[PDB]
C-alpha cells in the first residue's frame with residue numbers, strides 16, 4: 001500500500017553493518033540515509049505521495065540541450081554524437097517528435113563527425129572511435145529519415161570495423177587503442193543496424209565475450225576484470241545480436257543482475273558492494289529483456305509472461321522519487337547534478353520497467369499517474385523498436401558491402 | 404612550462420611564439436546542434452590544436468599545446484593520439500612523459516585515456532618497475548577504481564609479477580573486507596598462480612571466506628566468492644558445507660545464507676541425490692521465504708527459482 005519504498009516493512013531492508021564499519025559500509029549508509037530522507041519527506045510534510053514524471057520540464061531541458069550546452073559539457077567535447085544520441089533518445093522516449101528541421105541539423109552535424117575512412121569521431125575533425133560511431137548510428141536511426149540513413153557510409157564503416165578487429169575475437173576501441181567488451185557491442189550494434197555484417201566479421205567475438213564472464217556471474221571489461229554493470233549489458237547485447245547468447249552461463253548472469261538491485265533503494269548498483277545509480281536502471285535492468293528472449297529461445301517454461309525478473313515497481317519508485325530534477329533532467333542519485341546521460345538512461349530504464357513484452361504477451365506496470373508511461377525502448381539498441389524495424393528493413397534493401 | 408592555472412597564463416592567440424599560425428575555428432556548421440559554449444580558454448587551445456593537427460606540425464610547441472588541450476579535456480583521444488605521435492617524432496624522454504602521466508592520473512584517476520597512455524609508455528619502455536607502487540597509491544585513495552584494477556591485472560600478467568599480490572589482497576581485504584574488487588583480485592591471482600581445482604588450496608580459500616562471513620555475515624562479496632570457488636565443481640560435492648551453514652541459520656542468519664542453501668539443493672537435485680522429491684521441498688519453501696519475507700526485491704527471481712525446479716524436478 002501502495003508504494004513499496006514507503007511501506008513500514010521497508011525499514012528492515014536498511015543496511016546491517018554487522019557492527020563492522022568499513023569505507024564501503026559507511027558510504028552506503030550515507031546514501032541510504034539520503035534516500036530515506038526522500039522516501040520519508042511525504043510523511044514528514046504530511047502530504048500524500050503522488051509520483052509524477054516531470055515530462056514538460058524534462059522536455060524543455062532536452063529541447064534546449066539539443067542545440068546548446070554550457071561549458072559544463074567541455075568534458076564531453078569529444079562525445080558530441082553521444083549527446084545527440086542521449087538527447088534525441090530521451091525525446092523519443094518522452095514521445096516528443098523531432099522537427100524535420102532538427103533532424104536535418106543532426107544529420108549534417110554527424111556528417112561532419114564522419115571520418116573519410118569510416119566511423120564517426122567525437123566531433124568535427126576528430127579521429128573516429130567506435131563509441132561515437134555507435135552513438136552516431138543510433139541517433140541517425142532515431143531520426144530515421146532517408147537523409148539520416150544516407151549519411152552513413154556502409155562500405156567505409158565496414159572497412160573501419162575490420163581495421164579494429166583483432167585475432168582473438170575482440171575489437172579495438174579505435175586505431176591504436178585497446179580492446180574492451182564495449183567495443184564488440186558498438187561493432188555488433190552498428191554492423192547489424194546497417195547490415196554490413198560478413199561471415200568472418202564477428203568470427204572469434206562471442207568466445208572473447210564469454211572470456212569476460214567472471215566467477216561472479218557478470219561480465220567485466222576485459223578477461224579477469226570484476227563484473228560490472230554496463231560492460232555486462234554490452235557483452236550480452238553483443239551476443240544476442242550475434243545469436244551466441246549460447247556462450248555465457250546465462251543462469252549465473254541472470255543471478256548476478258538480479259542481485260544488483262538494492263533492497264533498500266530499489267535501483268541498481270553496477271558492481272557488488274557499490275552504490276545505487278539511476279543509469280543502471282538501463283544497463284543492469286535492460287539485461288532482463290535480453291535474458292528473457294534468451295532463456296525463452298532455450299525453452300525455459302518457468303519464465304514469467306507478465307513481468308521481468310526484477311522489481312519493476314521499486315525501480316520506478318527509485319527513478320521517479322530519487323532521480324528527477326524539479327527543473328527537468330534526471331540524475332544518478334539524489335544530491336547529484338542533472339545531466340543528459342542520466343536523463344537518457346534513467347528514462348530508458350523507466351521504460352523497460354514499465355513494459356513487459358514476450359513474443360505475444362504485452363503487459364505494463366506504470367507507477368504513479370498514467371501519464372508517466374514512456375514509449376518503449378529496444379533493449380539491444382536502446383532506441384525505439386520502430387526505429388529499428390524501419391532501419392534494418394531499409395539496410396537489407398542493400399547487400400552486405402565487403403572490402 | 405606555462406600552466407593553464409597560472410595567473411600569468413596567456414591565451415595562445417596573444418602569444419608571440421604562435422604568430423605565424425592561424426587558429427582553425429571549429430567547423431560546427433551553419434546551424435549547430437549540441438554546440439558547447441566553450442570558455443574562451445578552451446576554445447583558444449583547441450583552435451590552435453586544430454591548427455597543429457591539420458598541419459601535422461611535429462614541434463616542441465605542438466607538444467606543449469597537447470598538454471593544455473589534455474588538461475582541458477582528457478577524454479580527447481584525438482589529442483592523446485597526436486601527443487604520442489609527438490613523443491615518438493620529437494624523441495621525447497619517456498620517463499619524463501611517465502612522470503607527467505603519473506601526475507595526470509593522480510588528478511583524474513577515472514579517465515580511461517590516461518591509463519591507456521600509461522600502458523603504452525610501459526610497453527614502449529618495457530619497464531613495469533614503478534607500476535605496483537604507483538597503482539597502490541591510486542588504490543590508497545579509491546580502492547575500487549576500475550581502471551587501476553585493470554592496469555594492475557595487465558601489468559601483473561604481461562610481465563609476470565605475481566609473487567607479492569595475494570599479500571596485497573590480504574592487506575586490502577583487512578582494510579575493507581567489503582571491497583569486491585579485492586575479492587575479484589584474490590580470485591584473479593589464485594586462478595592464475597596455484598589454482599582452485601587443486602584440492603589443498605580450494606580449502607584455505609573455502610576456509611578463509613567462512614571466517615570473514617562469520618565476522619561480517621551480511622557481506623555479499625564473501626558469499627559470492629565462496630559461491631564462486633565451488634559452483635563450477637558442484638556445491639553438492641561438498642556435503643559438509645550444508646551442515647556447516649545450517650549451524651548459523653539461528654545465530655548468523657541472512658538472505659545470503661538462505662540464498663546459498665538454495666543453490667546447494669538445485670545442485671543436489673540436478674544430480675540424483677537422496678530425497679529428490681523431499682529436498683525439492685526444503686528449497687521450494689526457501690524460495691517463498693525469500694520472495695515473501697526476507698528478499699522481496701528478488702520475488703520475481705525466487706518465484707522463478709521455485710518454479711524452474713518444478714518445471715524440471717516434477718513428477
Ligand SMILES: COc1ccc(S(=O)(=O)N2Cc3cc(C#N)ccc3N(Cc3cncn3C)C[C@H]2Cc2ccccc2)cc1
Nearest residue numbers: 075076079082131230277279332339340341342478513514
Ligand atoms: C560526471 O562528470 C563526468 C564523468 C564522466 C564522464 S565520461 O567518462 O566522459 N562518460 C559519460 C557520462 C556522461 C555524463 C553526461 N552528460 C555523465 C556521466 C558520465 N559517466 C560517468 C557516470 C555515469 N554515471 C555515473 N558516473 C560516474 C559515464 C562515462 C562513460 C560512458 C560513456 C558512454 C556510455 C556509457 C558510459 C563525463 C562526465
Ligand SMILES: CC(C)=CCC/C(C)=C/CC/C(C)=C/COP(=O)(O)OP(=O)(O)O
Nearest residue numbers: 131182185186230231270271274275283549
Ligand atoms: C555502448 C557503450 C560504449 C556502453 C558503455 C556502458 C558502460 C561502461 C556503462 C557504465 C558507466 C558507468 C556508470 C561507469 C562508472 O564506473 P564507476 O566504477 O565509477 O561506477 P560504479 O561505482 O557504478 O561501478
Ligand SMILES: [Zn+2]
Nearest residue numbers: 277278279332
Ligand atoms: Zn550513472
